[model samples]
Target: GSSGSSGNPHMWWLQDADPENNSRQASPSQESINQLVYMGFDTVVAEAALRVFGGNVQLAAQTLAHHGGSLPPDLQFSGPSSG
Candidate 1:
């Protein structure tokens, strides 16, 4: 009776719920970056251009030229060049 005085405790194991593991898209690849580098562009500059142009090497190159071989003032990383 002494052991039976305590009521039965409710115990349940927690279930492990796994979330979706899908991969996301819209990222630049190394090959695309390399292409720009092959054309003598800076690594960081090429990466930024590829990201800005959605991995389109052709368009990135064109835009690079259009901007005089550097990112536009609005997108420039950081520098002290007077306009």
Candidate 2:
């Protein structure tokens, strides 16, 4: 029951860096996910990343906005498990 921090892990991420300004990129979408796909990232990765970003593209682009980069992957039961 811990709150997550507001930052991402990028190559040159700054504590006060703005992803939108630093990187001239748009939002992430299913059709045009290519923006962030060149970096070995896909829909799953983007979706996961989005979860880490709380629907904030700027926050995500600022840094890597790691998907569970902290606290041993604080997994959320997004759906029911398959037996």
Candidate 3:
């Protein structure tokens, strides 16, 4: 919960997960992956991002965490690293 709530106020994620299968996926619908590709990223980064988020569109679209340095809703993007 902490990890998912650690990243920016716009992304949903996890702290620890199955590292081996983090970015492993297989979809025959090129159109689907192609649309996601439109977001712009290599298979690795995109895959990792999706995996970290568990394909939660709502979370990926408007995820906001109530934690920060001084404020409760400070803007962040790079998860823990951005801080």
Please report the candidate that would top lDDT against the real structure.
1
Across 1-83, the per-residue lDDT of candidate 1 in tens digits comes to 02333365423334543333234436565566668878877656677788777667778888877875575656555743345
Model 3 lDDT, full chain set = 0.34
Residue 56 error, candidate 3, Å:
2.7
Count of backbone collisions in candidate 1:
0
Provide the lowest-lDDT 10-residue window in model 3.
64-73
Clashing pairs in 3: 7-79
| Alpha-carbon lDDT, every model | 0.64, 0.42, 0.34
Ranking of all predicted structures according to TM-score, beginning with the best and ending with the worst: 1, 2, 3
How far off is residue 2 in model 2, in Å? 25
Model 1 TM-score (2 dp)? 0.53
The reply for model 1, stretches above 4 Å from the true place, is 1-25, 74-83
Instruction: Assess candidate 1 and give its lDDT.
Output: 0.64
Comparison by TM-score, 2 against 3, better one: 2
lDDT of 2 by residue, 4-83 (tens): 34454333433544434333344444322334444445444544555555544445444443432221143445632222
Residue-level lDDT tens digits of model 3 in 1-83 = 23332343422255544434333343222222334445453333333334445553223222312221122122335343423
